[PDB]
């Protein structure tokens, strides 16, 4: 059962250092070489570094080369990637990857779950979530929603009544501001016959700031 | 560095269709070149390493062939599980480089979007800041334009879009543009309307700042 966890990611501000570590289980850990790839919001993968199966050669890429170093602990199965200097460029999640060989070549046979790492000066900052409220305006389907606004950072998650509710739910992709907080609207459609009776709450979660809020949509 | 290049950047089919997926380097890279599949929220899997070797696991409809600067994946019949995103990346030399991804959506019918428009809350003004969000709800195709207008004047830079991906039920897509504007600049305004057209059709949704 090959597994491999990455941990040490969250904020971390530019020109600071943040290290990543990556737990390999359910292989021979020190015959096979290791990587790391990382990808930013809503963008392709970009192989990071990689290191071979004896940890005598280390290859890096171009936009991270003399200011990340990757490293292995062969009596413990575990990978390290130290990050300095680090840019806003550099917010990505980051994955350890498995190659089929003892460099890297062959290609990526074996990925792990990936670490959020974030790069910015913001501070971590619980959401504000304001109603959509509905009015009936359109007819037997009514939409309404949570404006969940000015959090930091990614990511937070929505329900709506408890997760009781889930047909029709569509919960956007959060955008970064100027100010460098987050922002993102879930809407959902719902009888418009119901919006006298059945009360709809969204369910915001954010993890980073060990903030949950739940903001009831009253029609208006 | 090598530079990989994938084509198209998206395309939609059914299931049953064949489906080919280019991807083209820079310089050659023998057949030093791997195939790979992501869906949203999940790691990459390997699909074929070597240009055509197909990796364990994987199902016998995906190959691949191509040698030196032109590559092919192709999915013989395209199977529900398959609509994803998919990479190629070269192990020729350092530093390994991906191509940008090729998306392949869930081809449907046109679909008009039903609009809705959200003023911001009295909540929400007591901050300082207002919020106007129009929705797209289920369309097809993803493209759409949106227009911003406050006292027909056609707003610009003051607003932001977003995209779901498809719908696991209908395969539509939903849209959302944010207009933010000051309080002290939504309360000198009074008409507010989200104006989206595609194809032949243009709506208009509004409502005025008081009722
Ligand atoms: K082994
Ligand atoms: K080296």
């Known amino acids: 059962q090959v597994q491999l966890v990455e941990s040490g990611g969250g904020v971390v501000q530019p020109g600071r250092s943040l290290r990543l570590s990556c737990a390999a289980s359910?292989?021979?850990?020190?015959?096979?070489?290791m990587s790391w790839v990382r990808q930013a919001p809503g963008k392709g993968l970009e192989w990071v570094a990689g290191?071979?199966?004896?940890?005598?050669?280390?290859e890096y890429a171009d936009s991270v080369k003399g200011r990340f170093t990757i490293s292995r602990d062969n009596s413990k199965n575990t990978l390290y990637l130290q990050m300095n200097s680090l840019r806003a460029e550099d917010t990505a999640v980051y994955y350890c990857?498995?190659?089929?060989?003892?460099?890297?070549?062959?290609?990526?046979?074996?990925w792990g779950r990936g670490t959020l790492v974030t790069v910015s000066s913001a501070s971590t900052k619980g959401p504000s979530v304001f109603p959509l409220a509905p009015s009936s305006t359109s007819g037997g389907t009514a939409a309404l929603g949570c404006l969940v606004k000015d959090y930091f950072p990614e990511p937070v998650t929505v329900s709506w009544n408890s997760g009781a509710l889930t047909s029709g739910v569509h919960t956007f992709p959060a955008v970064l501001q100027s100010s460098g907080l987050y922002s993102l609207s879930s809407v959902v459609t719902v009888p418009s016959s119901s919006l006298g009776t059945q009360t709809y709450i969204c369910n915001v979660n954010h993890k980073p700031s060990n903030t949950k809020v739940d903001k009831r949509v009253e029609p208006k | 560095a090598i530079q990989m290049t994938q084509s198209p950047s998206s395309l939609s089919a059914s299931v049953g269709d064949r489906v080919t997926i280019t991807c083209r380097a820079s310089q050659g890279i023998s057949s030093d070149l791997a195939w790979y599949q992501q869906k949203p929220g999940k790691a990459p899997k390997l699909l074929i390493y070597d240009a055509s070797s197909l990796q364990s696991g994987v199902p016998s409809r995906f190959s691949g062939s191509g040698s030196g600067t032109d590559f092919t994946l192709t999915i013989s019949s395209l199977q529900p599980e398959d609509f994803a995103t998919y990479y190629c990346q070269q192990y020729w030399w350092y530093p390994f480089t991906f191509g940008q991804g090729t998306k392949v959506e869930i081809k449907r019918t046109v679909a008009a979007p039903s609009v809705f428009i959200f003023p911001p809350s009295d909540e929400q003004l007591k901050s300082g800041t207002a919020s106007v969000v129009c929705l797209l709800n289920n369309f097809y195709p993803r493209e759409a334009k949106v227009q911003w207008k406050v006292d027909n004047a056609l707003q610009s830079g003051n607003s932001q879009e977003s995209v779901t991906e498809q719908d696991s039920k209908d395969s539509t897509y939903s849209l959302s543009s944010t207009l933010t504007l000051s309080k002290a600049d939504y309360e000198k305004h009074k008409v507010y309307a989200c104006e989206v057209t595609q194809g032949t059709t243009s709506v208009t949704k509004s409502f005025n700042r008081g009722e």
């Open positions: 290191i071979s199966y004896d940890a005598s050669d280390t």
């Open positions: 359910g292989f021979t850990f020190t015959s096979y070489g």
């Open positions: 990857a498995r190659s089929p060989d003892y460099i890297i070549d062959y290609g990526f046979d074996y």
